[PDB]
Design an enzyme around this catalytic site. Structure first.
Site, PDB file in Angstrom:
ATOM      1  N   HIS A 147       0.832  -1.185   0.000  1.00 44.54           N
ATOM      2  CA  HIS A 147       0.000   0.000   0.000  1.00 44.54           C
ATOM      3  C   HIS A 147       0.872   1.242   0.000  1.00 44.54           C
ATOM      4  O   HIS A 147       0.650   2.167  -0.772  1.00 44.54           O
ATOM      5  CB  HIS A 147      -0.895  -0.001   1.234  1.00 44.54           C
ATOM      6  CG  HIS A 147      -1.854   1.143   1.287  1.00 44.54           C
ATOM      7  ND1 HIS A 147      -1.877   2.043   2.330  1.00 44.54           N
ATOM      8  CD2 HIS A 147      -2.833   1.529   0.436  1.00 44.54           C
ATOM      9  CE1 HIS A 147      -2.822   2.940   2.114  1.00 44.54           C
ATOM     10  NE2 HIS A 147      -3.420   2.647   0.972  1.00 44.54           N
TER      11      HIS A 147
ATOM     12  N   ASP B 231      -5.981   2.175  -2.189  1.00 44.54           N
ATOM     13  CA  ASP B 231      -6.683   2.002  -0.928  1.00 44.54           C
ATOM     14  C   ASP B 231      -7.564   0.760  -0.966  1.00 44.54           C
ATOM     15  O   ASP B 231      -7.602  -0.022  -0.015  1.00 44.54           O
ATOM     16  CB  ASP B 231      -7.504   3.254  -0.599  1.00 44.54           C
ATOM     17  CG  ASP B 231      -6.625   4.440  -0.217  1.00 44.54           C
ATOM     18  OD1 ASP B 231      -5.426   4.224   0.096  1.00 44.54           O
ATOM     19  OD2 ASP B 231      -7.126   5.586  -0.215  1.00 44.54           O
TER      20      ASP B 231
END
Ligand SMILES: COc1c(O)ccc2c1cc([N+](=O)[O-])c1c(C(=O)O)cc3c(c12)OCO3
Lengths: 121, 121
Positions: free
Chosen positions: A47, A89
């Site tokens: 991420h 996300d």
């Protein structure tokens, strides 16, 4: 922004995002990246690398629009960067749910400064 | 940076800053400001308003010099912004400590979207 991120984590995992991922392993939460402790930590690592690769917008600040269609995060952004942001996300929230199965509470509040340095994204 | 902040909170409050304050109320930790739930939350509110007044330096990433001398945070930093940054962090650490007596664990991991929007700083 983290506002959407937080929501997605809730949507995917059903877990309080900060409690489970605000400080977990070497990569979930603040203080950047480190060698991942486990699969969950790896989600956060990936991420953060996803964020890093974003050229055209601010991943933590910039808000974007997404939808929840068929219990699925759907990034409806036309803005390319915000779209890539939303997908970053979405990917971590999905990753986090998929790795709940090996989530380990002992990695909560892991001492990040002592993590092994991370390989570059 | 969050490192200096974390350490000041720790020195002042004696609590793990991440666990106790990484996500408390509508103001402590990620996701900006909101109507404070209590005095502790208010500290973070003030803290974030303090950060807003800063003059270019990055409160998250920029490191600065302070010392813990005679159990007091001393912002020895001479650079104007980093000095105010240090002062912001000192203030919140002290504030959190001073309001420890009303710290409410129920507000730990408080869900930020449930917060009323903050008044302007
Ligand atoms: C505005 O906040 C939220 C948004 C999106 C989802 C949720 C959410 C808040 C929740 N909570 O916590 O009130 C919550 C909860 C729960 O109640 O635990 C369970 C969930 C959720 C959410 O999505 C999947 O399963």
């Amino acid at each position: 922004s983290l506002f959407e991120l937080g929501k997605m984590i809730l949507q995917e995992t059903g877990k309080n995002p900060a409690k489970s991922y605000g400080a977990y392993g070497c990569n979930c939460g603040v203080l950047g990246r480190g060698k991942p402790k486990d699969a969950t930590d790896r989600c956060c690592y990936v991420h953060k690398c996803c964020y890093k690769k974003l050229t055209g917008c601010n991943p933590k600040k910039d808000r974007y629009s997404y939808s929840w269609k068929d219990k699925t995060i759907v990034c409806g952004e036309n803005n390319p960067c915000l779209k890539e942001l939303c997908e970053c996300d979405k990917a971590v929230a999905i990753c986090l749910r998929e790795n709940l199965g090996t989530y380990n509470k002992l990695y909560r509040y892991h001492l990040k400064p002592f993590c092994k340095k991370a390989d570059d994204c």
